[PDB]
Design a protein around this nucleic acid. Structure first.
Lengths: 811, 812
DNA sequence: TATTGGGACGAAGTGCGAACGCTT
DNA sequence: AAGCGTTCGCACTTCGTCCCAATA
């Protein structure tokens, strides 16, 4: 291969430098330069110590950048003991799911009269009939208690502040605009603030200087963490070593002697070699894995050397960390980020397999996960970075560094350095949006991802080394290492594809969800909150050409209810069709293997558009929502005739034409589709052979049944419309009494008018039905489905908001 | 046929009512109802009279809704004579290309101190070194004249104000934010304002009340138009009558025996029948057509009854309107909307073929066009509305009317009645009237809405409108019957017009292609808005070949990769750009000359394409590539070529090899011809040891650019590096060249003295030097430099640039 | 050969009779 | 503090998908 370029050395140096800026590693140099009136100090020896809060010279805002295990919680309790003058002093402590409040609430046994809001079952609150006074909260739950907070507090604590600010960008975030304004009001008005994170950065210090001026901010920088039981040492391994894995997992029956390959060690230090050495040597080990796919493989490998291997991921029952002392090997994925830490001196070493992926965990999540085991008896942490999946050129380019350093550390909010109003958050949301964006973008590139992870380890005082460079690494050495890793990672994929666990206990729903194709599919058609097992059930249905056709029809109908100009402009319809009804979709075949399928484009969409126009109006009239299960209204055979009769002969003509289409124009007019529609019409009673209602119900049932897979099911409802008996409001009761001209206003009260209907219920008996959407199809984004924006939602907004301009125009 | 429903009668009544509200037909009721302190008056008898401008009680703002031909220009001149208290009183008059300023500037001879900006000449009026004191302006040039404008004027006149505000929404609008701020300053600050349009509406009256309060606004409603020309009578015809056209354009050879078609009269009065009657009767006729396709057919028909037939459209040489008195028939299209009016009493009657289309002219444009001939000697206007193309259910629904009337006449800015992101940007002025532009374009989807709008505009200009067989009144059921008839005839007649299409005896294919919806939609997605239809036909002929089509898509993808740089980084984002640009359906022109749609089939594995586009996007950026600008901004030599490839040479070699030897036909870009021709080209390249590194590098570079994108490495005529030709070098570019070859100098800063140095040292700059050149087609592509008003594609790329992929199976 | 009817059990209701927020 | 409107618990029933046992 080619020798290392000077450009490769500048790429490296730029990536490291931007990583250092994003997580606050530059803070001691940047503060004096850019905010000269803000005081700063560094504490390199022993635990951190915050300023004496009772002194008149102690500033209103203090911000702390100090390691996990630097003594922060002890310095905070000391600072609160000094800050709190009286029981009349109010206090607010905000935290996050990433670092549970229960640890603070436990250690705060040291302080009088402080309590925490239960994020579960928040009723029966301790400060009953009063606003909260001395309170611990998690930001993810803050909107629940916002109206029962004091308007202002005497002390504000933000713990893991960058993790707190990170929640604003989560898809689960709720009442965002309120939580923005609430936090901003507290920041602008509390007379003492303390804000702490291992990664508190220049933009936080800038923001607090913006709200309160340099002379009221102080910064303290920790560069010490507790030795001994927490003196962790990290090693990046060069090679996965699947040649050992495949030889171990080999069936023991045949002799199967070795081929003349993998004879040289190629720098050895394999992930699997090093792991086997610990397992054979009798060590207790814990293994983080980014992917379930690999977690299952390494569990199989561990189950050869031991019996007692625990495996934890989202689709396993949640094992509490107290149980982990029972096992020789514990394998987990990022799910333990939601749970508590494991404290006991049980494990000798830790292994980690990290694979950046566009829809994967971010490196800051990975770091959180690696921390969940607090204590390691031998102090080893071995990391393998799988760069297949992440083979792109860097995002932390020299151009971006030159930009950011020119603007005094002010980052661009998106990768084009020199925008449209696609979001509308407040000061807080806009200030830190850059950090969320680069945490997700850099996953595209292994070099950037590695540099971020290395930065996070270094800022927490973990000594990081790379194999064969066990002192310090020059840019050329890094580029050689990283070049080697990309090659190893790329060749190992075939071994991991061969070894992919397909025994019944191996989770196909989890393994499917780690595929990029599935993430894209989910992002375009489906709701974000659907379970992987629901998706596999849909993808199995999509494998059949009939199931796939019905899926696309149903997704088009939903688009037409979301974009009502699609029902009117053929031009807009062609944009919606090209987007939702052409391209590639993931399916699962009968073997259980994931398999992509093309949706061929259609030259003439006119028959489809006419049909969906008709069906969209009748869908709207029946209050259709696939997510809600189908039709909101009940309807009877008379309503069916009323729905069809305005355009009856068009429905007849279009279903006939679809049954006899001369050309196989794309997906929806393929041979099986037109055959099925013809077969359906061959069974339909002729237009004069039965009552108008009988023919109308037959036709309606064929349209909904064949095209969308939607069943006209009989209803047990006592009364028409949407209303269940027990939920019937007074206004709807009056409507029902008037609809039959029943006696009215005997009394004004609900219970009287209810008692009338419950006597006259027999007058409301009859044939009654609902449209039911199939089992799949309930997981689709619909007009009712609230969702944070993406490319598809914004495209539909554009198609709704912007009109078609006249083309060949005159000046 | 089934009877007309009461729901159709509500649809009709809603459509009419919303049309009335949009063009200010409701103004006499709505002002008393919503702004009681704003005085209003009705002038039903004789020409309009504005308030006495010299009175102490006469209000600061007056706004006038009055017909074309109602006397407005005389009332304006009278009002100005009264409003101008002194020789030093300043005046600004703003108008539009639709309402051309020279008619005012001519009649303003009576106030001969007033002058107009010669926006066409673009002369350096700033040489006067003083503000313009009494000025007439075309709104689209207002920014350029911005400097010579008194910060405030004593009198502000807005002429065809609605037509003026309409320019803000034009694609060709320039420096919008500046023109917005300028007009909004003037409206807030000028001591007297008068604003006039035949369609001045409630939202303008509301906006002026918003800036100046009800007590400072007064409204005049005119309902009279001068007889002799605006005594025009309009009749909507139920049938096109293509049976007569077919019988006429039939060759003289065959016997053509009779058939039962139109043996029953179908109540008569066809477009072509009525036209034939006037042509045979010796009348002089003018014909508006919405489409060139139809204009050429009616020109062929007229050339049977007469010799002297003129025809005018965007691809004809645009002859001056004064010449029209020479002809028995003049056929024209929207080209005359921007042109001048014809005043002499030549034409007897006027015919109009109007066809709503999503990419066509709006009905207000059509109306302006009909207004181009001032006077018709027999007063007749006959209109045929072709609803094929416009068969959708209405946009002016009862629910929209209920919304608008509930909000006191405040329209929603889009068809969904809900408050959505600020995808487009503008001031108060732009946002206030955006709704009018939106509904002007959307209603083209529906013939009923389009007809009601055109009928409204005719009525607000005092033209008496009738429908055939309905002599004085038309109930909602009668209207719905008429529409049902029209929609049938219009759909029936399309086959006749397709048969009778000219078959290209050099007959103007580019205009007939440009009226296709598929082509409009293609141009919106891939091309610049301003390209000529003749360049589009040249591209669509190339697109017919699978090789030409492959190169086009590769080049469009490259430009997208330069626009959306995360596409070069995230395979998820690349898949969204690929799915959008490189899959779907595109229009082509086959060897016969007929238009033909072609599929771009989707690709299961785009990784080979993405790898190669990543390698080309970097290289292109380094070469300052821009297809519009013709190719590479930089010149480069064979030494640069080796430096471009060498970081990834093994990848370029492997990818072009694999692209040659791909085992699977995975969509368009990996089709059999594509892989075969890349293998042929690659196997024709010299082996790595056979030639110098630079020779191999240039061979590989030439193959990649040449086969995949169709771009030629062309030898440059330049004496010097960069982009300068000899006689066009100047001080800065000269100094930048004198940095080379260590030509240290102390010569003076004047261009020719420094040029004299390079004209000696030129021998040191000579060598093998090249540019990449885009083919003839492909210069019409929307590139990263191509400024354009937003559309769905521009906004999709914004979203892919701004929004990051979020972790999917997400932590709880 | 493949019909066919029955068991079997999730989804989606009933509806008495009650809780419960609140403003009278 | 109880008169009122909304809304839910629990023990039931109806409908229809599914496949297995019984044979048209």
């Amino acid at each position: 291969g080619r020798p290392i370029g000077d450009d490769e050395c500048e790429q490296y140096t730029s990536s490291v430098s931007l990583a250092r800026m994003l997580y606050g590693g530059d803070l001691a140099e940047w503060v004096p330069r850019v905010h000269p009136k803000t005081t700063i100090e560094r504490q390199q020896h022993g635990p951190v110590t915050f300023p004496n809060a009772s002194a008149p010279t102690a500033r209103c805002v203090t911000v702390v950048r100090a390691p996990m295990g630097s003594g922060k919680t002890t310095a905070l309790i000391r600072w609160l003991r000094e800050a709190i003058h009286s029981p009349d002093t109010s206090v607010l402590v905000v935290s996050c799911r990433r670092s549970f409040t229960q640890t603070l609430a436990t250690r705060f046994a040291e302080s009088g009269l402080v309590d925490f809001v239960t994020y579960f079952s928040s009723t029966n609150y301790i400060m009953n009939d009063r606003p909260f006074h001395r309170l611990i909260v998690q930001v993810e739950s803050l909107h629940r208690v916002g109206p029962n907070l004091l308007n202002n507090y005497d002390v504000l604590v933000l713990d893991e502040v960058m993790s707190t600010l990170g929640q604003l960008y989560s898809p689960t975030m709720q009442q965002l605009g309120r939580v923005d304004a609430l936090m901003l009001r507290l920041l602008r008005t509390c007379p003492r603030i303390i804000a702490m994170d291992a990664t508190a950065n220049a933009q936080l210090v800038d923001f607090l200087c913006g709200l309160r001026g340099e002379k009221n901010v102080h910064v303290v920088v920790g560069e010490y963490a507790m030795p001994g039981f927490s003196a962790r040492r990290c090693l990046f391994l060069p090679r996965l070593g699947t040649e050992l894995l495949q030889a171990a997992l080999r069936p023991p029956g045949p002799p199967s002697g070795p081929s003349p390959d993998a004879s040289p060690d190629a720098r050895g230090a394999t992930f699997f070699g090093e792991l086997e050495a610990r397992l054979g040597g009798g060590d207790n080990i814990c293994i983080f894995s980014s992917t379930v796919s690999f977690a299952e493989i390494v569990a199989r490998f561990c189950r050869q050397f031991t019996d007692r291997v625990l495996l934890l991921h989202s689709l396993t029952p949640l094992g509490d960390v107290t149980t982990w002392g029972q096992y020789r090997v514990v394998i987990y994925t990022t799910v333990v980020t939601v749970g508590l830490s494991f404290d006991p001196l049980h494990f000798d070493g830790m292994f980690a397999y990290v694979k950046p992926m566009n829809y994967g965990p971010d490196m800051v999540s990975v770091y959180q996960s690696l921390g969940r085991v607090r204590t390691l008896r031998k102090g080893e942490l071995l990391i393998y970075m799988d760069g297949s999946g992440a083979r792109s050129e860097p995002v932390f380019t020299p151009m971006l560094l030159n930009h950011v350093v020119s603007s005094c550390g002010q980052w661009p909010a998106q990768f084009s350095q020199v925008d449209t109003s696609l979001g509308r958050g407040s000061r807080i949301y806009n200030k830190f949006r850059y950090k969320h964006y680069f945490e997700r973008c850099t996953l595209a590139c292994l070099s950037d991802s590695l540099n971020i992870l290395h930065m996070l380890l270094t800022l927490n005082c973990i000594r990081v080394r790379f194999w064969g460079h066990d002192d310090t690494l020059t840019p050329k050495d890094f580029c050689l290492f990283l070049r080697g890793v990309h090659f190893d990672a790329l060749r190992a994929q075939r071994d991991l594809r061969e070894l992919r666990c397909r025994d019944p206990e191996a989770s196909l729903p989890a393994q499917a969800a780690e595929t990029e194709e599935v993430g894209l599919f989910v992002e375009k058609y489906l709701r974000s909150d659907v379970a992987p097992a629901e998706i596999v059930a849909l993808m199995r249905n999509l494998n059949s050409l009939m199931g796939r056709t019905r899926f696309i029809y149903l997704a088009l109908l939903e688009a037409c209810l979301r974009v009502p100009m699609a029902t009117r402009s053929s031009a807009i319809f062609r944009r919606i069709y090209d987007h939702y009804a052409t391209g590639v979709i993931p399916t699962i075949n009968v073997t259980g293997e994931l398999e992509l399928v093309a949706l061929p484009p259609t030259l003439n969409v006119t028959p489809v558009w006419e049909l969906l126009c008709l069906c969209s109006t009748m869908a709207a009239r029946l209050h259709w929502d696939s997510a809600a299960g189908g039709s909101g209204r009940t309807f009877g055979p008379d309503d069916v005739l009323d729905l069809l009769t305005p355009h009856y002969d068009r429905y007849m003509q279009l279903v006939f034409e679809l049954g006899h289409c001369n050309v196989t124009d794309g997906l929806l007019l393929s041979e099986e589709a037109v055959k099925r529609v013809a077969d359906a019409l061959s069974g339909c009673p002729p237009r004069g052979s039965v009552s108008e209602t009988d023919h109308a119900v037959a036709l309606f049932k064929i349209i909904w049944g064949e095209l969308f897979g939607v069943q006209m099911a009989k209803s047990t409802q006592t009364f028409p419309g949407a209303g269940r008996v027990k939920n019937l409001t007074k206004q709807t009761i009056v409507g029902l009494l008037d609809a039959h001209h029943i006696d009215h206003s005997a009394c004004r009260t609900h219970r009287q008018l209810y008692a009338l209907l419950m006597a006259h219920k027999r007058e409301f008996a009859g044939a009654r039905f609902k449209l039911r959407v199939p089992a799949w199809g309930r997981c689709l984004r619909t007009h009712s489905s609230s969702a944070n924006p993406n490319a598809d939602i914004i495209l539909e907004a554009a198609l709704s908001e912007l009109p078609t301009e006249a083309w060949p125009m005159m000046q």
